[PDB]
Design a protein around this ligand. Structure first.
Ligand code: GTP
Ligand code: GTP
Ligand code: GTP
Ligand code: GDP
Ligand code: MG
Ligand code: MG
Ligand code: MG
Lengths: 430, 442, 42, 67, 38, 442, 442
């Protein structure tokens, strides 16, 4: 059961570099690619993320895409960069210019065939293929446009697999790019049709995690990408280690999605605590559950207290009792009963895996389906409507070839997504 | 003499590990299948034959199949400690799970795996001379256990016909829960199980957690404890086939005595001397004390209170040092009690069994060593409360057709929900009518 | 029509052979059983 | 800092052990704890002597009666 | 709620009639065991 | 009780290496031809005589010839480990191959090498006192095997007359293929095999590959494995001449029992306990299980399904610890089965043989060690399907004269294609007519 | 004995080509009308007369007319392979189509052609001696089928009176559609068809597509496949009239047994062993298995679900090797089922038929060859849902007079729409009333 990863754009390539460092460390893979682990439990599922090259070596099942090779030279120069297969780096000769239309229509159609050829070469090698996993930002240029183009093509070629995405979205307080709302709106329009499950992360939430929980004085993008790589490697842990109650991406989707368009999720990872304080408090299931529902530890700007949970899933890693897990989830459901949708008798799924991440006694990753995600989309739609009434920068997109009708379709689809979440928030049994 | 065990999915394989650990340690078979006999004079007793067959070199191999759609747990059994005990063909594993969908197990994926399983069961049934039933262990909360268990029971029921099928089933606990879609899978499983099973044993994890907290002193139990208790129960019920005794009980006598009407086959289970090693030496454990223990609701492995219903039949299995006169005195005292009530059409409510072999003690176990034990299986109208709560949860969720698109996409007609829900409604009304006093005489 | 009678013929033959085999096995086991009882008595 | 998602008390420590290996190890399958204690040396010697004598007398009786 | 159209109204009406029929059959169930006196 | 083996071409010599390796190790002759004595007092024993003759000094030498047109493989045998076992004149090699042309082997090149071969076969037959047949191993897909095999069988049939000739033939597999011109060579090989052989057993590598993947656990088999299986089959069939047994079977009994009409002499072959060492200690292997195995299509060494036809005769060889009563009970159980059908004119469909010598285990081999085995050769109308696919491929190529100029250049008339194709068509009609029930009574 | 077939418009003529192909191949007449020179006709019996008449020279010609308003399809019949079978007078064609207008067919164009058709039918009917009905093939969605079918049935019904008229009718599927104006034409057709047809069988193309996807293995079906299925159904229903059997069934017993009230004459049809030629050889399929199959919704050739209604009458036709005791056991088992419900005024719900001639296999066909089949005609209240949804679509379009000006220009008062719509509303109320339990109050 093998997963194929796709990394697109600057953010995607950097997060991918940190993710593959974490995965190579957990399975004891040397930066030269040699297996150096010390237990068969590490080796028995190495196939899930690695292919075997001759005489010991392993190569990572990943596709790297970018329009200017600067990032590719940066990842190749990194400490684990050598592990990547040279033929898996695909690049053009001119940038996306932060424009969705260039990335989707002009350089996208020029490079996309070579990416589909590489993805098919990688897909057809698996004995049984599990879903694809993609990381990219929606605010950029090549990440949003070519990522959504490739997602559409892979959904045409492999409609029976799973499509899962990790996505970075523009912060409400400081913009990194002026035209972020257009790229975000067009990308959300593409994702709601093509994706099976989509997870969203705000950089502002990672800064609040770092400042309040870790008390870091001068955080850097390496810390944010480590938190993301930790949770990403955690979601798949039950696929690749033994446990008392196994779980799988399809089983998570089946328990989390009540209706097919409601596939946007919140993310969290529990054991976060500053290096000075950590000597003063031991890990235990009540502490993990209390931190798990605390909004300071959640990777979105929306707060759960303004919405209600339709469904949630918790995957536990470590040697622990099932009694504490079931009774904690019952106690949290009973004490905060107003925040759970009443027409579902139990909203939380639990799963238990025996092998924790290195250096932690126990760990849990949390995935949540909450209507407060509607608040993020409304803010982006507001900024989009403010620029569009005045045709603020539209000539770039129209000169590339976009029909204005595409902008009105994306606006209508995003408004309908916000409305459907709001309607399910205020639904009743009657 | 022989019985074949079928293990399905996650709960069934994990409970199988505890069961086969117990049967090996009780007979004396080593993890590699050999019996370390102390003398050559005399001959080795035939009691193993119910569960093991010997090769011409004297190795033992067990009469069981392990069925799963995901490989991980069976690969863990293949790589664990009992690797050499099981025959590799018996451990069957597919590539991918039924993802909590009954439809995916029954229509799309189990249809590919079912013919290999039937070929293995046929290969076992050809190597028998007195097969007298199938024992099945599975959970109805998950997708592959429900879907493949139903499809496989249907095929065995057509191929083998009259042979009996007794099930030990893990149902969704009344307030502890693990997955959102549990009501749909449990309803659809129960619809197939109603027509094609002779006796169904009901289990709830919340009851075994309560029993392990109150009687034993374990604050943080895990599935290995529950599975060891279930293995002890199965060993007690099957002991009547394997060892000498005053009053033996064949599985057909079990079916004849406990089931009054062909649909009324769901039974409650309890076990008496659940006690810790430190408490066991301060107290005597006479027959009357454990007989009084089996009727208290604190002893049950299903979360239901029998004071809200009526008993129809009880089957009491005693193993160890017991004398029939003490069993008679105990049953007469129970009959005197005012809080125990039987339906007026069942005057002779009890079946007894007495076996001489006392229960075995497992090195890492948590139960004390005791000279005698009693196990009870009983038919009671109180079980109607479990179905009423599953059906109520189904009605709340089905009112918005929650998650239904998964089931329709994997191959099932929407009509099957309504048919199963109407059949379970009829079973609830059957339990209402059978328990109604015959005050009207015409 | 003759096929059903022929199938019944093989079924009856197999049944009677099985019964005779079981009887022979019972006798052979019984002999050793009572011999070792006698040795225990002595 | 290198201590994000890690513990400074015992870093570089991975607990590569599953539940079943601890629960169904080779210690729990040992049959030496289920055997009743062995007799004393005098009783063993007397048991061998008595068994041999019984065998001899049974064989002698069988030979005398069946010739 | 989504915009009201002809097809959506037809589907909702037919589906509600379906649900009412199903509920009526659930609440009007007849027995199957034979407890009648000979 | 002597037999002479004739090996032709590449497949026949490579299969010969495995056969003679097995026969040496089974009798106990060392690679240098000497048999190390075990007992100081007593007769020497004489069982090798079927395959070996001893000199007055006690060296053993085998009754075989190796025939090839290219030197490489026979020179490898001359330089290999068994250099001293064979007499050097017996290993005959020409200068150049028949280049996948049957015409080149038959007309141009085999005529030069054939007279040395006939002189050696004559010198062997003069050194006999009981001869009961020639065994021939060849492939009909290649040029020298087809052309020189046909020419040599014709010369043998004139010179030796009544003596029996039993062929083991590798026919072109139904979808695995190695060369383009296989249909022409196989069609032309037909008449030679039809009028110049007494029983011909047909093998296809795709079936033996399937058997080695499914039953043994070999992911990447090579020809040495297939050749070792063929050697085991030949050893099982010739064991009846060499060792003590309850029911012996002479080679003439095969022809008498298996061939109803003189052209209907093509038979299917299968072998039962093909099993790996890890599975072998988990299972008993009784007579009824291996008898049930030889009738399953997963056991055959030829790619045809007998359920699409009717059996005319079966010959079952049991070797090892088997008792005749169990063989009779097994055959009666097979006769009971509804998916096994015999033509109504063949009521007594079986011939049995029982030998006490169990099958030998080869140090580098892949088969497990087992106490008993059964081998089957059977005549069935399903074999007609193999010819239909050969005829379709020939018709496709011959419709446009795809390669005929090579054959016409090497000496053959174009008329020979149509004549051979009509003879094989008549053989297909014979197999259609013989299997038709006698519903018409006059 | 005799029956006359009337084929109207495009669907009816194209289905007729498949029907007469099948009936020809089943009896054994050549495409030129002559019996084979090799057949011995041992029965020496007049089996053709149900569908054919013979000339004094022994040529056969069939009892059918082909009626169409456009030339192209009938010219295809005149120039095809069966050119010599039909008498040229039998193939009647007008000048121009009814352009999907019921009004054009009924008022403008069919009025010119109708007297030729009536004269042809008269010429057929005087040359008969035991005529027992008309078979009519048409679609109600198109213009000529609706308008000329209604006009011709009206004239036939006045002239011939009590004589039976049986229609096979393709109604517009509930979401697959081919033209915008289908609801208007189907309502106006159904108004005439209610009074002037004796039994009407309903088909929907989306259901036959679903059946061909699930049961057959056809990825890209076309109308020829559906027409081959229809031909098989018609051959199954009329075989009981034409060949020897245990329980024969004349066409007049259907009306007496199936129709409770004179308006309630619309019946559902389904067919059991729909299986593809490549596979399904292994399953023999007992009577009870195919009887269980005909009640599953995957077997029906009309898209309606009978679990939402109650059966009023069933007619079960078994064809092939079936024994009456097995039919009786199967029908009693069906009657036992709880998800199958009959109206309380119809206690004896079933009619059976058993015929010895197995179904014929057509050289280009897609069904497998099978020894037995069962065919069903059934009366059920579920059909009321199809009309109600058609009426809703009519109401939707008519609320804005979406196309009415074409119809008004071609000749109709607006009142005629409202009259027909009120009559179909009354038909809905009849289906409401027949399904009413109507307990006896006192
Ligand atoms: N007592 C007990 N309950 C168990 C055990 N394993 C799982 N369960 C329970 O059974 C239910 C889960 O059913 P599973 O067996 O995991 O479902 P499955 O058969 O794997 O079906 P799929 O998920 O589709 O593969 C939950 O209620 C678990 O609590 C076990 O070993 N012992
Ligand atoms: N089982 C088996 N088949 C073989 C072996 N060698 C070749 N074959 C098969 O036999 C056919 C080739 O025949 P060859 O023996 O190579 O032909 P040849 O006798 O050398 O004839 P020339 O090529 O003219 O010299 C192919 O179908 C091969 O797959 C072998 O060692 N074992
Ligand atoms: N089963 C089947 N249905 C058909 C076939 N051809 C057309 N139909 C259906 O019949 C309806 C169309 O009727 P037509 O036969 O084309 O109408 P028409 O008789 O030609 O009337 P005009 O268009 O006025 O000439 C639609 O519902 C089609 O789906 C066919 O070959 N087989
Ligand atoms: N969390 C996170 N955000 C990043 C990272 N690198 C870039 N970004 C953000 O992504 C956006 C820039 O998008 P970019 O990747 O350059 O788009 P591209 O030009 O299409 O590749 C800005 O909001 C950056 O803050 C990273 O490593 N982590
Ligand atoms: Mg599972
Ligand atoms: Mg060669
Ligand atoms: Mg037309």
């Amino acid at each position: 059961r093998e997963i194929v990863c796709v990394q697109a754009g600057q953010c995607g390539n950097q997060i991918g570099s940190k993710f593959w460092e974490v995965i190579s460390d957990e399975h004891g893979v040397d930066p030269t690619g040699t297996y150096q682990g010390d237990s068969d439990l590490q080796l028995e599922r190495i196939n899930v993320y690695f292919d075997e090259a001759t005489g010991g070596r392993y190569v990572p099942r990943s596709v790297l895409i970018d329009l200017e090779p600067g990032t590719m030279d940066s990842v190749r120069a990194g400490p684990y960069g050598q592990i990547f297969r040279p033929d898996n780096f695909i690049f053009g000769q001119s940038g996306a210019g932060n424009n969705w239309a260039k990335g989707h229509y002009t350089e996208g159609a020029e490079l996309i065939d070579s990416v589909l050829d590489v993805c098919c070469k990688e897909a057809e090698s698996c004995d049984c293929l599990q879903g694809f996993q993609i990381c990219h930002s929606l605010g950029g240029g090549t990440g949003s446009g070519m990522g959504t183009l490739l997602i559409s093509k892979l959904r045409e070629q492999y409609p029976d697999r799973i499509m899962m995405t990790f996505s970075i979205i523009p912060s409400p307080k400081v913009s990194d790019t002026v035209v972020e709302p257009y790229n975000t709106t067009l990308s959300v329009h593409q994702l709601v049709e093509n994706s099976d499950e989509s997870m969203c992360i705000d950089n502002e939430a990672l800064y609040d995690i770092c400042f309040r929980t870790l008390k870091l004085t001068t955080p850097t993008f390496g810390d944010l990408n480590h938190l993301v790589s930790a949770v990403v490697s955690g979601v798949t842990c039950c696929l690749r280690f033994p446990g008392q109650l196994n779980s799988d991406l399809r089983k998570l989707a089946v328990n989390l999605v009540p209706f097919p368009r409601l596939h946007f999720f919140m993310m969290g990872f529990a054991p976060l605590t500053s290096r000075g304080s950590q000597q003063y408090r031991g890990l235990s299931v009540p502490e993990l559950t209390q931190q798990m529902f605390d909004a300071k530890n959640m990777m979105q700007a929306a707060d759960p207290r303004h919405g209600r949970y339709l469904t949630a899933s918790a995957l536990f890693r470590g040697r622990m009792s099932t009694k504490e897990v079931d009774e904690q989830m019952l106690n949290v459901q009973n004490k905060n009963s107003s925040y759970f949708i009443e027409w579902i008798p139990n909203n939380i799924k639990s799963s238990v895996c025996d092998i924790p991440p290195k250096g932690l006694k126990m760990a849990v990753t949390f995935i949540g389906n909450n209507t407060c995600i509607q608040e993020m989309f409304r803010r982006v739609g507001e900024q989009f409507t403010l620029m569009f009434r005045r045709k603020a920068f539209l000539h770039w997109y129209t000169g590339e070839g976009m029909d204005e009708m595409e902008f009105t379709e994306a606006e209508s689809n995003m408004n309908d997504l916000v409305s459907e979440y709001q309607q399910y928030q205020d639904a009743t049994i009657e | 003499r022989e019985a074949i065990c079928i293990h399905i999915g996650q709960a069934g394989c994990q409970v199988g590990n505890a069961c086969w650990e117990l049967f090996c340690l009780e007979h004396g078979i080593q993890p590699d299948g050999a019996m370390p006999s102390d003398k050559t004079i005399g001959v080795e007793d035939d009691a193993f034959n119910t569960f093991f067959s010997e090769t011409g070199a004297g190795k033992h191999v067990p009469r069981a199949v392990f069925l799963d759609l995901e490989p991980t747990v069976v690969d863990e059994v293949r790589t664990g400690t009992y690797r050499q005990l099981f025959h590799p063909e018996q451990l069957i594993s597919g590539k991918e799970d039924a993802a909590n969908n009954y439809a995916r197990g029954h229509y799309t994926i189990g249809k590919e795996i079912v013919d290999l399983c039937l070929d293995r069961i046929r290969k076992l049934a050809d190597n028998c001379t007195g097969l007298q039933g199938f024992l099945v262990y599975h959970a109805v909360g998950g997708g592959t256990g429900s879907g493949l268990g139903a499809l496989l029971l249907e095929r065995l029921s057509v191929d083998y016909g009259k042979k009996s099928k007794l099930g030990y089933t893990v149902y969704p606990s009344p307030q502890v829960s693990t997955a959102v879609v549990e009501p749909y899978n449990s309803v659809l499983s129960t619809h197939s199980l109603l027509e094609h099973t002779d006796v169904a044993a009901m289990l709830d994890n919340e009851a075994i957690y309560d029993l392990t907290r109150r009687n034993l002193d374990i604050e943080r139990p895990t599935y290995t404890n529950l599975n060891r208790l279930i293995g002890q129960v199965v060993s007690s019920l099957t002991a009547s086939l394997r060892f000498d005794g005053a009053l033996n009980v064949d599985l057909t006598e079990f079916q004849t005595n406990l089931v009054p009407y062909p649909r009324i086959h769901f039974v409650l289970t309890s076990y008496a001397p659940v006690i810790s090693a430190e408490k066991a030496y301060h107290e005597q454990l006479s027959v009357s004390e454990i007989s009084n223990a089996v009727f208290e609701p604190a002893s049950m492995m299903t979360k239901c209170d029998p004071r809200h219903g009526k008993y129809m039949a009880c089957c009491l299995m005693y193993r160890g040092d017991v004398v029939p006169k003490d069993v008679n005195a105990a049953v007469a005292t129970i009959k005197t009690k005012r809080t125990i009530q039987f339906v007026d059409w069942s005057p002779t409510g009890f079946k007894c069994g007495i076996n001489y072999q006392p229960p075995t003690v497992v090195p890492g176990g948590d139960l004390a060593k005791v000279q005698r034990a009693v196990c009870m299986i009983a038919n009671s109208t109180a079980i109607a409360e479990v179905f009423a709560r599953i059906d109520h949860k189904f009605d709340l969720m089905y009112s918005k057709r929650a998650f239904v698109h998964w089931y329709v996409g994997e191959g099932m007609e929407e009509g099957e929900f309504s048919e199963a829900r109407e059949d379970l409604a009829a079973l609830e009304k059957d339990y209402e009518e059978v328990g109604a006093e015959s005050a009207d005489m015409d | 029509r003759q096929r059903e009678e022929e199938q019944r013929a093989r079924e009856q033959a197999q049944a009677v052979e099985k019964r005779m085999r079981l009887a022979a096995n019972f006798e052979t086991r019984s002999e050793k059983v009572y011999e070792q009882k006698d040795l225990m008595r002595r | 800092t290198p201590y994000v998602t890690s513990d400074a008390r015992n870093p570089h420590s991975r607990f590569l052990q599953t539940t079943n290996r601890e629960d169904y190890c080779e210690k729990n399958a040992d049959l030496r704890t289920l055997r009743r204690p062995d007799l004393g040396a005098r009783s063993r010697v007397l048991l061998q002597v008595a068994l041999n004598a019984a065998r001899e007398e049974k064989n002698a009786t069988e030979a005398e009666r069946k010739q | 709620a989504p915009k009201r159209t002809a097809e959506l109204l037809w589907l909702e009406q037919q589906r509600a009639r379906q649900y009412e029929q199903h509920r009526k059959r659930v609440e009007q169930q007849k027995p199957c065991v034979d407890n009648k006196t000979p």
